[model samples]
Target: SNSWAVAPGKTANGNALLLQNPHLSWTTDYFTYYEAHLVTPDFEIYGATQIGLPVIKFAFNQRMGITNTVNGMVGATNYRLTLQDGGYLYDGQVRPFERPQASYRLRQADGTTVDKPLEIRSSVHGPVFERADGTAVAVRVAGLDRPGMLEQYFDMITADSFDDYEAALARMQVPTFNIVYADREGTINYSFNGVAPKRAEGDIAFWQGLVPGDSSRYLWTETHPLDDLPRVTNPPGGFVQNSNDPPWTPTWPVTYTPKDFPSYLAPQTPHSLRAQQSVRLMSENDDLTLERFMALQLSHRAVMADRTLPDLIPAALIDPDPEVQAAARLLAAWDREFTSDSRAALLFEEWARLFAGQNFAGQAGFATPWSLDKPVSTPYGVRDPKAAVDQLRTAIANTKRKYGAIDRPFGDASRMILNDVNVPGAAGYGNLGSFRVFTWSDPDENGVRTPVHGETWVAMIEFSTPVRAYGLMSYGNSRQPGTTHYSDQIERVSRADFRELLLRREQVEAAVQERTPFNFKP
Candidate 1:
């Protein structure tokens, strides 16, 4: 560590910047976002986390002074948040009316020891930070829960070099996630084995443990981290970015691969929309401008949009059932944009929903266009035409008997506009929730599937020569109708425009242009 010349610096704002060469084990690769605020004596420090190291991983030269990569800087009301243990809350406040003393805990098989190390009643985890200068910044940090594991993880992060860290991870029995690295310095490094060792629990000895300690999950853990997780922060001429893709293609500047590293550390979900779009657009141009980068992130049109929509609409313009036929024609003639303005999108989406909650048994091409590997009939994957026809027929009958037509736009039948009008537009339309063409499943009327969670936070960053910018999103950032980021992101995200901020840095400040008065700080 002493041999390495990298040292921390300070930002234009009075914050310290650490050029941290942190250690991250190689198991699974993740682009996680974190936000937190630490009240210090002289400085109220806000930090963000870019997931690579055990600590606030990487940072731009001017990253908000207190360490950590700020992924998505969210306000309290950005998305609908829930307690780890489920219950109802009127606001961020627990409704005084209904009281059912519920305790959420994760325990070992013996049933006496608690597994959960972090718990917060109402303190928001990832709220946006309003700097003393009034410039809002997004920040994230390690949660108080499991700070011990975090400390172990942090030890790995601050290692001497990527090689030293890779060696450390290889020594673990159960791994965790991956971390790939690349730089303009003609340097490429990979680490595998993202497995976190299990902490001993009480009485019951390993009874079908879930995450943190599961045998099947260990196999999923990378033997080591990958080769291309990190990239030059501010490249000389080109840029570096990762949208949760495999480590092989961290950047066009210098591409690394699974062959160079270990397989366990490589991306499991390699064909993600974020990764695909980033690579596709980056490869399309050599200039790598910020505007272009932002455009790539904000893209709402599905990557395989055209490919999947048609299957849901129907190959033929007509169906045997009059209602199905009518729905088919409307969808066929409609513009393919899943944008809110597209009225036909609602009808097509409704048809897509009918195939939401069923499981098929054989090589059945269900109603939806996409298919799953474990499928007979799963969600949006292979929709059995006969099954789709059946559901639409029944739905049409119900709609007529109830609301009177299957042809009504989805917006009319299923309105998801939030309490805020500025956020007015479809809320839960077209893969907004998990039921995209890829991950389809039917939930009971109560919306429970193991645990039904909303949009996980997403932070996308791009490098354009000397400048680096980012954008952020979460499914339910807030319940506050008045908060600026609340329904704002929901509308833009549904239409694919919400991602523009991270793609283009200028848009971050641009969002404030339309803000209605509200307290921007604590």
Candidate 2:
């Protein structure tokens, strides 16, 4: 998932803006969203959520908007417990396992049923499971007793200001996520909001193990307070984004330093290509208008190509093989974008796939590795020049053999398929450094790759007069077959389009074709 927020100071309209593109599973029941426009006497919010959730996960009210992006915050740990006297060893004592029993009914074809009993054992660490080996394993998860997460989200929907929202979020009931927030008051913030177990000793790698359950020294009962977690509140850069990157890479002159937090809190890693592209998109320009911010969400530039092709094309041109030189010319003429009519994206993607596949252990084969001082442009050259050019020739040949031409249009090779609709798609893959990402299925017999997953729900909100929001639920209302809105959004999503949300009551009533009434106790 990707989210970006810009404060009023950075925008042309002097208003805050937020864009959300949550990349969820397309084929699973859990990932698809249920759209909602809930209203009450006090306030109203419009957003979407997973089907079973009562509170909206990605939502906004008149005052503010919030979108959750997956962050690298550790909350749970597994322990290898030694069994002693029909129980597990804890510290210097043998703690007895508490067995809880429940019954499940198995219904027969004739509607009759038989009862079956089940028992789940637990220890002080939480749930206990017997492993294939003699050792028993115990899993402990955080926030299981914190039942106010839904209430916290409800508070978020009604929060009148950024401060009020932070107060609710400081409850830390939500287990993990980076909350990307922007409000009508022109406030933009990024809160690495989550519960990370605070251990007195050991680093992230030491604790990320089958920790021995024999000692209480390894136990972590307290979570890091909200103050300890990293947050950026209207930074000088005026913008913040998380393409699921670490806290350090969200902005230039990073707001959060690695030494400021414990090693166990988050991973120490470089920005992914997708994150780099996201930063480039936001930081490269200023005076962002509402329309320009909307345009940012649909950017299809491939950052990997942008970084590598400059060196790669030059290397290929000097190679002895004519095929390598031929491929170099094709890539040299490219715009480094994965747009519908791009004749070189396919060849570049093929080359990237092969080049990355054969790299050394834990290395991307960059001639110049990413630099901490200059993070965006350091990892830009071809490392193994000969191998890279060799792969380039193979990729060019593969592209020509697969598509009948080396200069094949990206849209023709990658398709958008939702139920019965099959259309040309120009969305790029995230791993290839594209901010607008939607992956494809394995190639069919004829080499067409259909859209698999990306951009489950996209929202671009500008905190302006009347508070305009452009929303798209990529795989519309339901995942069940034969539903009306199941495939209704394919055309728009395929075309990189969005529809503005109706915020006013009269406007909502004016557009309604039908209504279904329901109520819940207040």
Error of 1 at 165 (Å): 8.5
Tens-digit lDDT string for candidate 1 (128-178): 333476532222222223335455444344344444544543444222333
Model 1: ten consecutive residues of lowest lDDT: 1-10
The residue pairs in collision within model 2 are none
Q: Write candidate 2's Cα lDDT for 1-522 as tens digits.
A: 899999898888888888877887787887768887988898888898988999888888777888988985778888888888987788789888999897899999999999999888887788887777766888999878788988998897689888888899899888899989999988888888888888887777777788888778888788888999988988889998998877887776587688898888777666677787789889987999878887877877777887688778887899888877887898899888888888888888788878776221124768877776776665777888888888887888887777767887888888887788887888678877778887766567677887677878888888887898888887788776678888898789877678878888998989998898888898
List per-candidate RMSD values in Å: 16.3, 2.8
The number of the candidate with the highest lDDT is 2
- Which ranges in model 1 have alpha carbons more than 4 Å from their true place? 1-175, 178-193, 196-286, 302-305, 308-318, 353-422, 425-522
User: Distance (Å) between predicted and true CA of 204, model 2?
Assistant: 2.5
| TM-score: model 1 vs. ground truth | 0.45
Shift in Å, residue 286, candidate 1: 4.5
Instruction: Give the whole-model CA lDDT for all candidates, comma-separated.
Output: 0.34, 0.82
TM-score versus the correct structure, for each prediction? 0.45, 0.91
